[PDB]
Design a protein around this ligand. Structure first.
Ligand SMILES: CCCc1cc(=O)oc2c(C(=O)N3CCCc4ccccc43)c(OCCN3CCN(C)CC3)ccc12
Ligand SMILES: CCCc1cc(=O)oc2c(C(=O)N3CCCc4ccccc43)c(OCCN3CCN(C)CC3)ccc12
Ligand SMILES: Nc1ncnc2c1ncn2[C@@H]1O[C@H](COP(=O)(O)OP(=O)(O)NP(=O)(O)O)[C@@H](O)[C@H]1O
Ligand SMILES: Nc1ncnc2c1ncn2[C@@H]1O[C@H](COP(=O)(O)OP(=O)(O)NP(=O)(O)O)[C@@H](O)[C@H]1O
Ligand SMILES: [Cl-]
Ligand SMILES: [Cl-]
Ligand SMILES: [Mg+2]
Ligand SMILES: [Mg+2]
Lengths: 386, 386
């Protein structure tokens, strides 16, 4: 009952381990339906049991690799390895490495600063209108903190040096930094052993692997001109449209016919597909290659254009409410947004208003006409008169 | 384009001001439909334009006051004052004050510690199964940081002293601490001037006041044995049922029939009301007096019991899917949850699994029978006819 037991102050690192949820999501098991890529049937929707926080620390490193394609458009490949037996994951990318040099203000080598100190980022100057997913200066450190071993290797031909250093025990200590002369092709490679005890797991099991493999497919579908490999296996995705087809290729509507898909690449920062849903409103969307699984104003901005036009039509031919049109829709959106905001570090819901996007996404009259003719108007029209 | 310009490190305080969104929500204007309490009108649903972060710093202090009723059941009153002309908000509560004594580990007085230092809390020991809303040790400091003036006054008969101190300039400095002898009835009073420049606002305008007044009514409805005053006038709310009645009194469905309202106080930690919606699924819910406006597993837990029973009734008389039943429901839930988790500091979505709630909420056979004759089954069965 002492005042010192009751009222306690935590360090930032202590707080992350004590209160992980707002940083990485739940550290308890969840059982829910998800899209996964299974070793035998591929992309499919099924019940899975997994720990969100474990999935998220993988996501943080993977999105960081996609971010390097905006930093260096000459980057060409991402290679992911997953080794359940040794509890080992690595994510490698080419294109420009991280500068191997001492930071004159923070007085340590740049790779050690930005992987080993909290609140460090190249995304803190919003006069730079960037379409990277990184915003807060946490993600890589969060992966470090929830790993028993975390290694950073990055090679910079500009500085003619390669950097390598390892952290251990939830970012509680580090081994010696290794510097070596370098004159080859730049790359960065992050290799980590997740702290499965913090997630109450015994190994990287079937479900979490299938989620991680699907997330790699996401990256292959949402990035431009980046080849993605998983354990050496090239992921056979060319464009966002071919990614979308993996979800639809084989299912038919409840009446029995194949799904009609409306598509437009609106500009270099927006691509949209629309089909029908039998499960209520559904959206699969990405902002700067982040999976925005709770949606956000980018989904609203696109979906509302469609809804308003379809509601206009049923009025001409008739009382109809927006939510009734929306619950027939399955929308896919791939967007590049300048300096996005989200509700949380996990970046599931993108909250930035359209006036700040840095681009527009006005669907064409052709897209809209095809949406009017996809059957939603007819279904609702028959409903109202009845 | 130097390394020091590109890669930057922030202090915790700098980061909060630079990246407010995951701490307090958006600091930009939002225009959306909300429930408010308008002068001379009462509770009503209309479009409002407001800044979420401003609403949230008020919420943090108001929930802290409600939390003290769990700490000290002798507490009886919360008094809220809103003064737009002088840009002043004040929130007062009685029951036990904060101990006015030097913390022997942190070497400063307890009120100064827990209102002026980040990551300070009495809620960090989860072996204590508490139903306070406080979890993370941020809320009061976030209000301080987003205020130009922030005053803490608290009186502790146990220590025979009263404490008073003012912070200024986004928690950048503090004035002189005042300690005085005290031997009366304990209270705490938090008075702050929000830094409207951080929210691009000029005054506490009609819409934000109407949201804040409604939030005071929420507290009157969601707490037990606490009188609530707004600018010195007692709010005429008794229990949660009388609060819900402010939303539903005299409301009709689209065909002009009165809404049917089903109610059960299931136990001392759960109270539920159900009626019909014509706007898709709607939920108004509270966890530990926090408004959970994105919902969470407490809403799912209650709503899914209802959905599954109604779906079964429809199958007896018939194809129908759960989401179709759910989109006819408007549910109200007031819950007390042990050590809840959320996606973010703003605590809009409660993520804790039901097996960890610390209590159950199995709706009675009487409630379920009334819900079956609610008019939802009717609506659905007219649809399958078409
Ligand atoms: C904590 C886990 C958070 C999460 C991470 C992630 O990566 O994916 C998630 C996906 C998912 O599988 N995808 C696949 C592609 C990425 C993506 C982008 C946006 C939305 C969804 C997805 C997901 O799907 C549920 C889809 N059903 C919801 C119910 N509805 C009636 C039927 C549809 C739910 C959560 C996540
Ligand atoms: C950033 C702002 C977050 C927020 C804070 C807050 O306090 O209330 C909010 C309320 C609201 O007014 N209430 C009243 C009582 C408290 C409460 C608890 C749970 C849910 C709602 C509410 C709200 O209502 C939207 C209701 N429509 C959603 C669309 N649907 C088709 C029709 C209904 C949306 C956000 C907030
Ligand atoms: N693969 C990579 N190649 C090059 N630079 C990288 C790579 N991964 C990370 N970085 C850099 O390391 C910094 C820190 O990464 P991280 O901790 O994830 O913060 P962030 O990505 O900026 N923001 P967030 O992920 O939203 O918390 C980034 O800002 C990048 O500059
Ligand atoms: N009105 C009050 N009466 C008594 N104690 C209070 C009051 N307001 C705040 N406190 C105490 O001050 C501490 C700090 O408050 P706060 O910064 O809001 O953190 P919190 O409520 O514990 N967690 P959170 O709000 O989720 O960030 C709380 O843990 C309480 O112990
Ligand atoms: Cl989010
Ligand atoms: Cl939340
Ligand atoms: Mg990152
Ligand atoms: Mg609090």
């Amino acid at each position: 009952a002492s005042v010192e037991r009751i009222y306690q102050k935590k360090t930032q690192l202590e707080h992350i381990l004590l209160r992980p949820d707002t940083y990485i999501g739940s550290v308890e098991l969840v059982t829910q339906q998800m899209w996964v890529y299974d070793e035998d049937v591929g992309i499919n929707y099924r019940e899975v049991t997994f720990v969100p926080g474990l999935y998220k620390i993988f996501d943080e490193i993977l999105v960081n690799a996609a971010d390097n394609k905006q930093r260096d458009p000459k980057m060409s490949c991402i290679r992911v390895t997953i080794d359940p037996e040794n509890n080992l994951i690595s994510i490698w990318n080419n294109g420009k490495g991280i500068p191997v040099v001492e930071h004159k203000v923070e007085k340590m080598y740049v790779p050690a600063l930005i992987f080993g100190q909290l609140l460090t980022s190249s995304n803190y100057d919003d006069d730079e209108k960037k379409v990277t997913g990184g915003r807060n200066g946490y993600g890589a450190k969060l992966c470090n903190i929830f790993s028993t071993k975390f290694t950073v290797e990055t090679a910079s031909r500009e500085y003619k040096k390669m950097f390598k250093q390892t952290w251990m025990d939830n970012m509680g200590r580090a081994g010696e930094m290794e510097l070596k002369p370098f004159n080859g092709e730049d790359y960065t490679c992050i290799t980590f052993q997740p702290d499965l005890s913090k997630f109450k797991m015994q190994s990287l099991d079937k479900d979490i692997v299938a989620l991680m493999v699907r997330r790699a497919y996401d990256i292959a579908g949402s990035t431009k001109d980046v080849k993605v490999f998983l354990n050496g296996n090239k992921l056979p995705v060319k464009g966002f449209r071919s990614y979308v087809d993996m979800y639809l290729k084989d299912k038919l509507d409840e009446t029995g016919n194949s799904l009609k898909v409306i598509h437009e690449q609106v500009n270099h920062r927006w691509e949209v597909c629309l089909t029908m849903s039998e499960k209520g409103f559904q959206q699969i969307s990405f902002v700067n290659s982040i999976a925005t699984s709770k949606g956000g104003r980018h989904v609203d901005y696109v979906a509302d254009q469609i809804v308003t036009k379809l509601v206009d039509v049923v009025k001409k031919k008739n009382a109809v409410k927006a939510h009734q049109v929306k619950n027939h829709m399955w929308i896919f959106v791939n967007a590049l947004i300048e300096n996005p905001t989200f509700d949380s570090q996990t970046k599931e819901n993108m909250t930035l208003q359209p006036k700040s996007f840095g681009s527009t996404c006005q669907l064409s009259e052709k897209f809209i006409k095809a949406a009017i003719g996809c059957g939603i108007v007819e279904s609702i029209l028959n409903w109202v008169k009845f």
